[PDB]
Amino acid sequence: AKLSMTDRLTGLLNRGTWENLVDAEYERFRRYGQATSLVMFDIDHFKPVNDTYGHLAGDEVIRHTADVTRNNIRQSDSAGRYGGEEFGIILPETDAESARVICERIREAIEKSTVSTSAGDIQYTVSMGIAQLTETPENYMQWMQKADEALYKAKESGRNKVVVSL
């Protein structure tokens, strides 16, 4: 019964469990210094999508996003549903430049997608933020903060894009 750890709608890890994994990777880094990156991404114009096509359509968009993610990342990477339309991925042994590759592959897969819903045929995009862990963040939440900041820049910078935290 691994139901305590997963999000019902997407099947991905839930926020609580995913964060525990982020914290575990953070401490592993503090000890060993391996390249490791974090991704935080959101579905673009979600509210508008939800308002326009209905919440059921929105759920399908969320489920498809999770499916694209699940089928596009390594079993050693860890994806989680952080919030309503927000997702996160832990990418161990992966530096910033390498993270951009998997992120772009996901971005493109989503961009080329068509969510066949009962309300209509939808096309959407995602904004993504990447933050490779450095010695600066003093706890895992400050690491998450850097990725979230990169995500905001991606959204404000045009959306349907990947931004790496500098």
Ligand X SMILES: Nc1nc2c(ncn2[C@@H]2O[C@@H]3COP(=O)(O)O[C@H]4[C@@H](O)[C@H](n5cnc6c(=O)[nH]c(N)nc65)O[C@@H]4COP(=O)(O)O[C@H]3[C@H]2O)c(=O)[nH]1
DSSP string, 68-83: HHHTTS-TTSEEEE-S
CB of 87 to ligand X, least distance (A): 14
Sign of CA dihedral 58, 44, 123, 104: negative
Minimum Å gap between C-beta 28 and ligand X is 15
The residue with its CB nearest to ligand X is 75
Contacts of 32 by beta carbon, 8 Å cutoff, 6+ apart? none
Q: DSSP string of 124-147?
A: --EEEEEEE--S--SSHHHHHHHH
The single residue among 77, 151, 154, 163 that binds ligand X, judged by CB under 6 A, is: 77
Q: Which is nearer to ligand X, 55 or 74 (CB)?
A: 74
* Strand residue runs (E) in 12-120: 13-14, 36-43, 78-81, 86-92, 115-116
Q: Is 105 assigned to a binding site?
A: yes
**Does residue 73 bind ligand X (CB under 6 A)?**
yes
Q: Kindly indicate which of the ranges 20-28, 70-78, 79-87, 142-150 contains the residues binding ligand X, using the contact rule CB under 6 A.
A: 70-78
| Residue 148 interacts with ligand X (CB under 6 A): yes or no | no
Which residue positions form the known binding site? 74-75, 77, 94, 105
Contact positions toward ligand X, by CB under 6 A? 72-75, 77, 91, 94, 98, 101-102, 105
